[PDB]
Amino acid sequence: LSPQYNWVACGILEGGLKAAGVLEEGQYNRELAEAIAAKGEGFWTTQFPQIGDWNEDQAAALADRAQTCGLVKADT
Numbered sequence: 001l002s003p004q005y006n007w008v009a010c011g012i013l014e015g016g017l018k019a020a021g022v023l024e025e026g027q028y029n030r031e032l033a034e035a036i037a038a039k040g041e042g043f044w045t046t047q048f049p050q051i052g053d054w055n056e057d058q059a060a061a062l063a064d065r066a067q068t069c070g071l072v073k074a075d076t
């Protein structure tokens with residue numbers, strides 16, 4: 001219930017995700033994570049495995065925040 005996952009924050013989130021253009025209709029947690037990671041990888045990820053990982057890690061976790069907001073469906 002608390003100001004962790006309300007509609008405002010989730011709105012800011014949903015906004016931000018459509019902004020960077022990775023959100024989609026009927027989308028699954030995993031599909032988004034992979035899209036966020038795509039737009040995340042550049043020099044630093046492609047040149048450093050450890051940052052390449054950090055990317056996938058945060059990309060994955062961000063989709064989790066996104067799932068709790070009802071923005072994406074759980075993987076099936």
Ligand SMILES: C[As](C)(=O)[O-]
Binds near residue numbers: 025
């Ligand atoms: C209201 As909509 C464009 O996030 O399906």
Ligand SMILES: C[As](C)(=O)[O-]
Binds near residue numbers: 024025026070071072
């Ligand atoms: C529930 As939606 C992110 O398709 O408007």
Ligand SMILES: [Zn+2]
Binds near residue numbers: 025
């Ligand atoms: Zn929709």
Ligand SMILES: [Zn+2]
Binds near residue numbers: 054
């Ligand atoms: Zn990791």
Ligand SMILES: [Zn+2]
Binds near residue numbers: 029060064
């Ligand atoms: Zn997950």
Ligand SMILES: [Zn+2]
Binds near residue numbers: 014
């Ligand atoms: Zn929406």
